Design a protein around this ligand. Structure first.
Ligand SMILES: CC(=O)N[C@@H]1[C@@H](O)[C@H](O[C@@H]2O[C@H](CO)[C@@H](O[C@@H]3O[C@H](CO)[C@@H](O[C@@H]4O[C@H](CO)[C@@H](O)[C@H](O)[C@H]4NC(C)=O)[C@H](O)[C@H]3NC(C)=O)[C@H](O)[C@H]2NC(C)=O)[C@@H](CO)O[C@@H]1O
Ligand SMILES: CC(=O)N[C@@H]1[C@@H](O)[C@H](O)[C@@H](CO)O[C@H]1O
Length: 577
């Protein structure tokens, strides 16, 4: 195979123009918030075809839609690239044309939606254009999610308001069971059992789903399964509720019930790597061996993710990190940087480095995603190398991981900084592939990374945690902000957290992100299969984090040439508390 040399040649602008436009970008976003339409229009008038312009235009359109300025809205909406239109902007545009095409899928969402989309659904409901079953499921989901005003407004649009005498008032009164606080009460199940006979099938099913969901996410597995067992129509459940029913069944090793629950999930959820793999494990455990193999093949086909790897291992396939494509040609790598949109991203990236401007760097990321948005796989792999060469490490990974068939593992799983990471890992006796896997997920190798809550650097150590580490290993807490000190702190904390959690690497990974006390709370009174512990982590961020860090670690270990450790063995057994 050759990679194609075809690269885009979009109009380029001088560095001066890119930097001038960025100079005005924060003020343009402020002008949207201040409803200074003349200022926003002036910023966009001579903007390049950039992510800056797209972002300002999208934010402007949300404001124009909220203010029902439809002539100007329609004019600016048409200027967006279709794949660049924000969800809420699309909802406003369709609503302005009385087109409720999107409502049939949007109403399946049981949580907060942007205002334009929330209103699209209310308008569809008032015109009788919503499926009633789905609409009331959304009302219930909003009630259980403390979106009470949105629930009230949708019920009113359905013709049954909360202060009416009918269905809406009954749904609203059920907050004494399904409220965020009510559902935790020791008497919630007794209260629901007393009123059950007066509830509809759908109200009963949803309310038992709320109580089961709370118990399951609290890891009270027997009670969770008792409550979920009372759900007569499982399709009434929110997606989170039915996934937490599956998680309780998985954790209890109820393979039949797990398969039954998965069969009631939306098709989208059934076809996820998670539930393809665990349904396959259920079929294996019940002696449905050929069907297990079929499901493992489907899970393995979903990509490079945690469950695709575990599914491959059940088929006898181990990770193989050789590339199945050649390197991009160097002339194409050079010409890619000449494309106007790629150049703009590289200009903002390089100037963010030289000027120490973290906000400019974030907009450089946005320009990169914008520039590469439509790219076929050959262009993605070419642009990934362009990014890597310029030191734009997170965007090298971003572009390389977006392919489906053409795999360059050296750009998906970059490993800069080995002259620092490897020795710090060795010094505390921790697996370097695990450290690289953790860095990839934490920062994507961005030296200056800072999360919204203040986690800092390559290894995303919190200032309060850095303070404690510094006091234990003879450092100044400000070394958190240097690459070498950050890696020393993060590796030491991986090792210390592991020591505190029965020396288990799965617990340590969870504890790094959620705190050691959380990781320990999530253990059971008996041992847990490692992937079962991971899939039943109550915090969605940490659950996703553990699977991504451990899958990354498996790829790094293969690239590093370490003795082979199957991912299922890396997950191993999480000990009883
Ligand atoms: C929004 C979001 O999720 N951002 C995450 C960010 O949370 C991740 O950072 C991790 O956060 C967790 C949760 O706060 C940190 O856990 C705490 O860690 C400290 C230090 O180990 C624990 O305090 C100590 O507890 C012992 C036991 O009782 C006491 O003896 C000590 O006195 C006490 N020390 C101090 C200084 O108080 C604390 O209990 C943990 N919290 C909980 C709830 O268990 C964790 O350290 C932190 N990780 C790092 C590497 O800093 C971040 C990284 O994944 O990602 C996101 O930005
Ligand atoms: C810069 C930033 O926000 N990085 C976060 C990190 O803080 C978090 O621990 C991790 C969890 O998946 O996800 C990364 O994207």
């Amino acid at each position: 195979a050759d990679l194609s040399a075809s690269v885009p040649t979009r109009p380029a602008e001088p560095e001066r123009k890119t930097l001038a436009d960025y100079g005005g970008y924060p003020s343009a976003l402020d002008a949207v918030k201040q409803k200074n339409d003349a200022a926003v229009a002036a910023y966009l008038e001579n903007a390049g075809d950039s992510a800056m312009a797209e972002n300002v235009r999208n934010e402007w359109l949300k404001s124009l839609g909220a203010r029902r300025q439809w002539t100007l809205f329609a004019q600016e909406y048409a200027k967006l690239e279709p794949a660049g239109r924000a969800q809420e902007v699309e909802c406003y545009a369709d609503s302005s044309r009385n087109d409720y095409t999107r409502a049939a899928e949007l109403v399946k969402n049981t949580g907060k939606l942007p205002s334009g989309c929330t209103k699209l659904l209310e308008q569809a409901a008032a015109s009788g254009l919503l499926d009633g079953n789905d609409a009331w499921r959304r009302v219930r989901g909003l009630l259980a999610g403390r979106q009470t005003t949105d629930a009230r407004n949708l019920a009113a649009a359905l013709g049954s308001p909360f202060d009416g005498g009918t269905q809406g008032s009954r749904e609203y009164a059920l907050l004494n069971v399904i409220g965020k606080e009510a559902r935790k009460s020791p008497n919630a199940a007794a209260l629901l059992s007393e009123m059950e006979s007066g509830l509809s099938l759908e109200q009963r099913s949803f309310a038992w789903g709320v109580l089961g969901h709370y118990q399951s996410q609290n890891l009270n597995v027997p009670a969770a399964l008792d409550y979920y067992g009372k759900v007569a129509d499982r399709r009434q459940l929110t997606d989170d509720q039915i996934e937490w029913y599956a998680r309780a069944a998985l954790r209890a090793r109820r393979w039949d019930e797990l398969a039954s629950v998965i069969s009631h999930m939306p098709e989208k959820l059934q076809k996820s790597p998670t539930w393809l793999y665990w349904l396959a494990r259920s079929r294996a455990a019940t002696g449905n061996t050929q069907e297990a193999e079929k499901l493992y093949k489907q899970a393995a086909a979903t990509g490079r993710n945690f469950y695709a790897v575990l599914a491959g291992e059940e088929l006898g396939r181990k990770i193989d990190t050789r590339n199945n494509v050649p390197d991009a040609g160097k002339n194409s790598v050079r010409r890619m940087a000449e494309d106007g949109a790629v150049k703009r991203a590289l200009v903002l990236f390089q100037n963010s480095q030289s000027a120490g401007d973290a906000k400019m760097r974030r907009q450089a990321q946005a320009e990169w995603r914008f520039a590469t948005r439509g790219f076929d796989e050959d262009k993605l792999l070419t642009a990934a190398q362009t990014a890597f060469d310029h030191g734009f490490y997170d965007m090298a990974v971003n572009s390389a991981e977006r392919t489906d068939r053409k795999l360059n593992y050296t750009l998906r799983y970059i490993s800069p900084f080995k002259d620092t990471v490897i020795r710090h890992a060795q010094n505390v006796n921790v697996d370097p592939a695990w450290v690289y896997g953790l860095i990839r997920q934490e920062s994507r190798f961005v030296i200056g990374a800072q999360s919204r809550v203040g986690a800092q650097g390559l290894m995303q150590v919190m200032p309060a945690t850095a303070r404690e580490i510094a006091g234990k290993i003879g450092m100044d807490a400000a070394q958190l902000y240097t690459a070498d000190g950050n890696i020393r702190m993060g590796t030491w904390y991986m090792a210390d957290t592991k020591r505190r959690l029965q020396n288990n690497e799965v617990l340590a990974t969870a504890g790094y992100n959620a705190g050691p006390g959380r990781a320990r709370r999530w253990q059971a009174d008996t041992p847990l299969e490692g992937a079962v512990y991971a899939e039943t982590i109550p915090f969605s961020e940490t659950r996703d984090y553990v699977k991504k860090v451990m899958a990354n670690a498996a790829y790094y270990a293969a690239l590093f040439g370490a003795p082979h450790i199957p991912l299922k063995q890396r997950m191993g057994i999480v000990p009883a508390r």
